[model samples]
Target: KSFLWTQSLRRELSGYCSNIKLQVVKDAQALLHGLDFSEVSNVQRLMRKERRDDNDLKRLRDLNQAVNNLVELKSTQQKSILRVGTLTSDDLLILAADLEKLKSKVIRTERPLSAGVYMGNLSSQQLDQRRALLNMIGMSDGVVRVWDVKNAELLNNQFGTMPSLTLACLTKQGQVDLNDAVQALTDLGLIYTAKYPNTSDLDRLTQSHPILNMIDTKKSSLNISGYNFSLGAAVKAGACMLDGGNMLETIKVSPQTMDGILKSILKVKKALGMFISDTPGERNPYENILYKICLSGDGWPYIASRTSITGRAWENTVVDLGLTYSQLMTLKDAMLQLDPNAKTWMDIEGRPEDPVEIALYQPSSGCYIHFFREPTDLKQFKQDAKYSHGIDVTDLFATQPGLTSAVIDALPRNMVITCQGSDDIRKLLESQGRKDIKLIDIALSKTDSRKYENAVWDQYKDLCHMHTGVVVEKKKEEITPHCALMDCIMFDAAVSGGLNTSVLRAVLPRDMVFR
Candidate 1:
């Protein structure tokens, strides 16, 4: 009576093919050499054809116990390694070696039936016992978050449209485009208010992830000089989703704003008739515009790109004016062409504009010269936590040099008259020049501020609208002789090309300027 183990072994070794067959047969025969044929005929032959002495039986029993202990140890180690996302080739090799050792014990035992029974038990236990095998390449259970080659659109919830009730309420007489917009929202499953998710709501969606359930497994390894291993791999693995070889989406804050900036740059290029020459080959022009999630016009965490046109890159067009006293008269040549009545002096010069600040410019390479209060070093600029003299203007030049010089020089001469622009720029200037400079703000401020209210509403209604912001008026008004009011909330019109500072300044009716 052959045991199942014997039958399995015979089946496994049956095939004969060239040299490989001979080598395999040789190994099998070597393994079988320890088998005893005397007890082959009976099912309990190992018990019946028992060891001739108690010591031999005890030795067999002891060997059997060692095999069971080894099996249990392997099982425990495998489970522990898997929980921490650590499984190595060496670990598997150790397991195979233990199994081989157990096999050797079965072969060497004297009672052939007891050895067969032991082999059968081993096979049965392995096959029947439930073991969670984590495959490097396989369908993931809910327990793991692997980078599946799944549709990224579905994963990112890249819904194309937002829902709107007001749009739905539109009648047949409404523009067909408006009706289609509403239908588009409906078709995209964004018609309901509940579908719109906030920051916390979006967070709640990932609450059921199994990764959230498990504790973070820490790994330690030694770094081998130039070949960064251990911690480097650990950091990379920890930072990214594994299994699909760790991929990241790299979401940017101002994707749309960057697009707009690119479009605007191209528009400027075309206006200058240099579009083809200055264009960045195949790369999107928006790539240069650094965008990030910021407090936007609507005050929500909206994606905002820099509105300032640093014009992609800077060129050193430095004109070194080595003083030829006779050629100094040519400074008026610069002023008269730029401004009709040229009384400005050229004894002083300054660095170019801080290109990050938002401004409008009509001429791409014009010589109207923008002066920026030098940027303070971010490291040295400190907040005192305690308020002192509003904001310290005495030490302003320590961080920001020459700012006090230009504006303060006019104060002693009594030529400094502060006429406010309807913007934050004017407010900052007025704050600085309060004591010495005579300041007036005559810009018309909104009485009800419907623009801000609408902006707030629009931010909250992300499910319904595409959140193109609103712009306030720039009309000026005279409230008092020295003190005036200015409507500076005019930045919202930036999308429509209305509030561009340089262009607007050039085109503004002289009546718009505050007296």
Candidate 2:
């Protein structure tokens, strides 16, 4: 009977009933028994009569809205639904009170959620209660805390004439566009909550890379007689040759001093831009070749080819000598530090085999450079066979074994070879017999013939001589001198285009300076 009274009152009178003195008290039992509509109708008629006044009518309307609000809350909040035959008058009163409170909050904030009215302004307990209430109503913590109805409306006004509820509809449909969501969050400055990589991580990754290890393990007391430059100067010039045909033999640093060298290299890389190369060009008679990863941003990774340095040949080489899986991932991580949405230049879908793999050849440990031979052009050979020669003297010169192997695989047996350390190369070849190949000195002339060779040698002399030695009966292979001639070519080109020596001097050894 109590349940019926509470439900009937809430449904018909909408939580309001102005009692009127009448003779219906004796027949209240009949009303309860559902046998007398006269008394019940009279009571309802009295409430309707009271609602004739303007204030009373407004009150009645508010009460009706309150009941609808409670019903709507129950409809949305699955957890708030009552079990069959379980709702009591007490529960109804409590729900009415809560409904009124919520409606008041909505009126104050012009939003449905109470958190919208008290976000960042409530006490801890109040916030907790609001959060709990929102959770009960199936709202996510992210929505309860991060959502902004006013901000959303402003976005809608800016984007189009669509209602601000469009995004809410998207959430309901579970079909929100991630890109649009990200853009919206970014525009509102709400996407920076996630941390990003900083310069410190950049430094650590640069230092730990195998590229710097070669600089550390180099022999001390190099004899760079006539080079007129130091290893420190080369690095300062933002030119580092890390190929198997090592460039600087005279430049040396102990393991402990490598950190400073790392800093110097990073300074150059940062200024020049990151250049990562996977394919290396052909080798000279001395097997002085290097396949390298170039990391420079400021145009230091580009070479001005007699043709285009970035021509089809170079592009083809990159496609052929793709990055290692580990290398790709590290590069991605490093680039993300610079640009959060960094993408790869090449698609590595199914190319993961080692590039330099043959008898007596493997990718040098700590050496990411992979040397390979470009296909032979017979017409160029017919035009300038003497000037443009490919010499394959792999077994003779054992200084750069892997480089020698690549040269043997690529270069023809009958081609002229102009190389640095020609005296050593000449002597080494003569001992093996068949000395038909004409070997020109790298320091032979200042003519156009030796232009690339001289520029590379002058730029990286200290590195070339750092580990210069000979091969006897199967001597254990040491670190091959990585002649970074191509790197020097690119660096020279970059310097020609406004890359200054002052930037180089900042990280160069104290005594080293630009020539």
Candidate 3:
């Protein structure tokens, strides 16, 4: 009975009435914004002086009044219907249309800020927290640490935690008795000799020494060059683009065309005359309140890949198409419009907001992006900052197409850590039975009076964390029509690739694909 009633003429008529109100207001507002009212008034005033008919002025006024009345009436119905529990999806749709109409009717101008304007501008309480978070971006005081903005944790939480690992050990007791002092002097002298400043000096020191050639000449020259040595001037620029700031200048993002791409994908699905799920497994969960025929498989439900995410690919792809990057940077605005309940936090601290399980970090080619607590704070780096941003490393892993999709709705963290934490390195070294070598001690061991070699590196492999762009490769072997273009395509394994509804639509000309 409920289903029958929903599909009845009475409901249809109620929807139609709302549509009429919506259509008129929207069109009228569009017309208003498209014209110059000042010019209209000038012409009307001049014409009145010549003929005194006032017809044009009266008509304009009448139009304005009618548009205002329609807007008020539409709002009344929208709110009143909601209160009475009779409002439907159609009603909301109509109200959206009316709001757009009224919105367009308003005139707008950009103005410079006035001094006294701050009176009405309330500063958020989180401003100080935001400033502090910004300040810590590239600061290095012995310990290496970084905020995990997504996990909301500091990824390098306990980095360099032990002061003994960083500060030089101070000795106490006797002032180096004769033999011990002699041994210490010999060690210090050897250390200074190892540094041996210039390449010529090193060559002089090892003139007849065997295995001396192993000391790379290129490295020798760089060492001699001192602060002037430029190892990677060419590739260094790529690191800059990876930072979020330059992405738009490097790539264009077109939203409309992307929306159309989605539509095309859906249309393709429809051409094959098959019903598809709006979500994973295609369950019709919203069947109770809404029941519009989905005719295609492009809306609402999205298939997630093995990575378990739906990182905003549509927007990213659109941005990459040469539209200004700034255009695609309006996610905050668009999100707010879609869900007015959106919020912002000054200190993310590596926590993902509820329901948003993943974050995508796609950078432009070769740019090194480093998050700093303050934009201008990059001092005391143990090594030269990799980019101007001062972070010794730029994350190449974050910039994958399907990475977000694989991460969204995933567990506390989706990354499969292949290597036990770095602490394991210290443990492995200690296991070798080198009594003098402790992990932290080895990290700070010095020759004469300089820091020693200390590093723990590991390789990572993720199907979605690729270094290249999406490449649709040809299938290695021959295949039939059923699996023609679908065979060997990489499809950014990070994206939803179960069944491409778009490809299916191209081959089959017709069949109301009941998606």
Candidate 4:
């Protein structure tokens, strides 16, 4: 305890002069290696005590910086990663020796966690150690690594100032505006390090949902037949966009990028209402009809408007009727237990049923028709499952037989009030005695309508047989072609736009392309 040699007095006795390596200095040099440089004098005395000879001081300074680095490391790293020192400082000396050896490796190259300064020099072991430490504090849940600062900053330069981070981050209490750049990511369904998410995947929803920050949405094109057009936008915007080839779309559906708005998901919906309908006019008869849904004995489903309840309307069935190529394709996928990948549809929210099983039934299986007689009829039938598939009165009859049923307590006799014939119910049309006025024993003749459409209907003006419907007798009522039944045919289209063979679909019999 009396001798200072044990502390750092020996370090003060060391020297740097060439002549100082005399045995005295050599002995001191060896001795100082074990001593603690705890004070300025402890280090200062190592310089030969000569103003010019102490170039060793600079070496001491470099060694000092290395020590500072470790202390900072200690602040974040657990003791298991970096051990502690002892009373006499032997352990510090040993650790300092190894720490100094590592200084040469301080600059590492290409670390995903970091790439600059001390980041570049870590040995494989320390790099692993660094990664391990980062896992405890890595962005997000320590679950993913943080982006290298430089590249992440580049996102702003590429897309414009990032919306304030607030839009997406909860931990940060920041808002983010995804704008176009982030929107592109959303379209891509892209994912990145945890840091990118606070905004991309905010914890709360923006309405429809936020649970998965999911793809709740959230196509235009042309092919043979006609320019691709949206039937919806045609009416809504009053104009159909010529999805065929606009001046801006030099490369359609570009592989390189969203062809500006030509292919952009971010676009306003609009269409000019010409060539489709007249808004002010009374609704067209073609548009108003509740066309029937039936299936061919040959297995294709079609819509029939002028047909009979016994479905003898056309005597037999054909596959000509349909949903637009687009809509039908969607329903077709719903078959065979595939993910239909549909966004919107209602198969009766109150269904106590199964569709796949219904689809498997024989095509000729007869359908049921349930017309609500009283308010309770609807309420009771909804729970009855007997014919519970349809939401509308007539929707009750189609496809697989047992899949549907009819509860029309009000029989067809009263409903079919007016009959077209020489044997007629003309009594209602003119004043007649109630005793003589009986329901018409009307005889129906399936006169070929193509002749009517050609000789009678088309001669009037532009004939709209736009709806090329087929009359089927119970086929497997897969719903693909049904919407084709609902969308208006617009007999009014006849007067609105003159009919031409190019616009006329082969509605009569598939063979007669000409009127």
Candidate 5:
């Protein structure tokens, strides 16, 4: 009977209750810290001149008892904020009332998500695997190589990696060498957090070119920018997330580290929808989750890995929050659970049971269209979309959106390869004649590394992996609707696509319209 449940939401509520309790105690203690015992002392000071009554004695004793309580309140928990229990000191009341109100609240968005396909960022593969959490309707995560705090190391798991510095990660010097300055920064333990340095801050993170100014400050459980490179992301985006990091490493991960990743993914949610309209091409079998969704036309940000995943997206008081996942069912089951008729506590703006598939890359256009669907169906759906006045089969063939592929094929040489696993690339395409294949190498992408190139480059310089925000076009406010705003953003993105596209985009013969 369960599809998606409120277990995660309930978990949020439980944490909120404790937060309110903890907040109240801290506020009370702080009040005591500044309390005035001067009033009680004032009465005692003038006692030498005035005749004291029995009432005065009564008041004095009362004041002394009050002093006793006040002293304890100030000192009992001053040693540590975490040790102290606690709001309003007024907003706390409002926050509490708001929580009560939300329990009875029902929110609905009138913006139509039924039209053109849009995207956020981040993913999941298996239900129990880390990628399972990524199956949450619209999300994906690929960047896995990063710094380790508890382990005091730079991590590079075998799965979800390029199969390394072997052109899989690009450096700012406009080269594709694993031994580049970027590699040295990570190796020397420089990069810490995800906020990639800003300027001199930027200069501080690089090696001789721009490495860290101090190496001692690099060991934090919060360094997420360890490997947020373009090729790292693209490679992670297309590979198997299952078994990326095993219990061997997962147990060693600090909650702060996981929390940092969650925050960044949430930032992505704040910036864009799921990554939509991926170009069509050969893809890994592990990407079946995303491929199937794009085929039906949909996507999120979550812990898109296997062992490390606990990506939970749920409703917090006034907004939505995504944490870290499982329970993978068919997409059909997904839509069924998301159905409003189920009377779920919140409306997530989710799935349509059988949305007509909108092929993004070459499926509905070019000669490739003739290979996938039927002639009769193609002719009927022909006028559905077109690149030119004459060429009609568009949705399945349009040249804009990205591609999602599961159950990978042997992929003929004509099929160009942009990203690949370290072993998978050479094993699959390398065996073919070299001339027959095309690569979307960093050298080629560097051709148009506009808005995001610098940020990506700056991030590698950190001793602490600084979080260089992605190159997405974000509308921070007045976004009454996602689709409309995204439509606007995508136009801006196409003209000035940042780090993401510079690495991913290439020749496409199709578009991303869902109809």
Candidate 6:
């Protein structure tokens, strides 16, 4: 009975093995011809490296050896072991180990091009395409729009066709007209005006005029004649650390000058956190606060006040903080709150007749909140606010601790923060427990143009598209705890090292184990 059973099991196993091999061959052919062949090929090489099944080991080893010797395996014979007598416990153990290794060694193909050698070689067009891949550049009608790169890339593949600038518009007269093109671009949320001599003149004139010269006054003059303006100007002159090429010099302005400037702006800083407490004729008391949060750019660099109820509170706060009239007006217009229902805040007996409060500032968000009694009036204000905030207020936002969480959250856990010659900004992060943020500082003096130009910007932007480095929320489950840190570093090393190796070489570089 034992002999008969053994013979029967062997016969069944032979048939099953034949079918499995046939299926594998068919699958391989299908994969090789498919559009996902690059992915398939990578997977196949990875599998072949780790496969330890006796038959597969023999076939792969022979094929690998022949290839390494600059020869070819001509035999079509497939090997198998179906006889019950051929099975062994040791063989099974080895195969299991190989399977485990194969399961653990996941490969990542998409990685940022390393700086200097790899990136420096790319042309501007190629760099632009790479930026588009990372969503750094919004491609539409040659207008380079900037936004949060991740958000932009998420919209890239919504359509089944190749996504490009031309596809984003609709045409009527053989091509989209100039006005319609601009309007269409506007509608797509081209929020950050790309840097050019003429493009942002309107944006700066209408919105950024007030804050434009706060950091550097040669670009725009501060409106004052007394010791205050001179003090501000002296502070600005001292802060002029950048050279002709935007490179930073080792010598910097004295701390005393910076201290004076901080003192000058500190009072106005308190008024920055004001919010609208109520919208006239509206019952939901939370709407004004909600509008404030939603209207602000995620409320960073300033925190909106939970308590302030009126625009007067906002006005008095900034005024008390000793903010200049221009600074006060800028904040008011930028932080506009909307009330679509009523034309004005219900008229109080003694208060001014102005239905709209011009601007409200927030501390944590480092931005303004403008309130309008009529919600319909918010359209122009919203545009004006959006355009100015990104350009002028970005540096200011970086300094506020309440807003620091937002910036930290925006960055990948593994990042290299490059401050363009802003040591105070660097110290702010260190004070906030972000000391591990690595850096290759690029000075922002105008003379260091070639070296420091995109040095920091490109590195920070690359973090957005990192294939590894940090286990982001969605990927937490995929990486095992013990291997997480090593795996992250390994992925980045491959990118920076520009390392490439064949499957067999990766698994056994010296060929010692195989030989």
Please state the error at residue 315 of candidate 4 in Å: 30
What is the C-alpha local distance difference test score of each model?
0.22, 0.24, 0.20, 0.21, 0.23, 0.23
Worst lDDT 10-window in candidate 3:
107-116
Model 6 gets an lDDT of 0.23
What's the CA RMSD for each of the models?
36.0, 38.0, 37.0, 37.5, 30.4, 36.7
The stretch of ten residues in a row with the least summed lDDT in candidate 6 is 107-116
Top-lDDT structure, candidate number: 2
Q: What lDDT tens digits, residue by residue, belong to model 6 across residues 1-515?
A: 22232223223222111112122223223322332323323323433331123343233333333222321111111111212122234433433332222211200001111000012234587556434433311111111222112222121111111001111111211143433422332322222112212224423432523322222222211111111212222222211211221101011112222222222222222234222221111112122122222121211101111111222111111111022232232222211211111111111000122111122111111121221222223454243233211112222222212222322222223344333333543554465566665543444343432232233223333321111122222423332111211222223222234322211001110111111
TM-score of predicted model 5?
A: 0.17
C-alpha positional error of residue 327 in candidate 6 after TM-score superposition, expressed in Å: 43
Clash numbers, per candidate:
10, 34, 44, 30, 79, 45
Off by over 4 Å in 5: 1-167, 171-176, 181-183, 187-196, 204-207, 210-515
Off by over 4 Å in 2: 1-176, 179-409, 419-424, 430-436, 441-515
What lDDT is obtained when candidate 1 is compared to the true structure?
0.22
List ranges where model 4 is wrong by over 4 Å: 1-249, 254-379, 382-515
Give the TM-scores of the predictions, in the order they appear.
0.16, 0.15, 0.15, 0.14, 0.17, 0.16
Q: Write the per-residue lDDT of candidate 5 for residues 383-474, one digit (tens) a residue.
A: 32221112223323432221111101212324443321123333433333334544432222323323333453443222111112222223
Q: What would the TM-score be for candidate 3 when compared with the true structure?
A: 0.15
TM-score of predicted model 4? 0.14
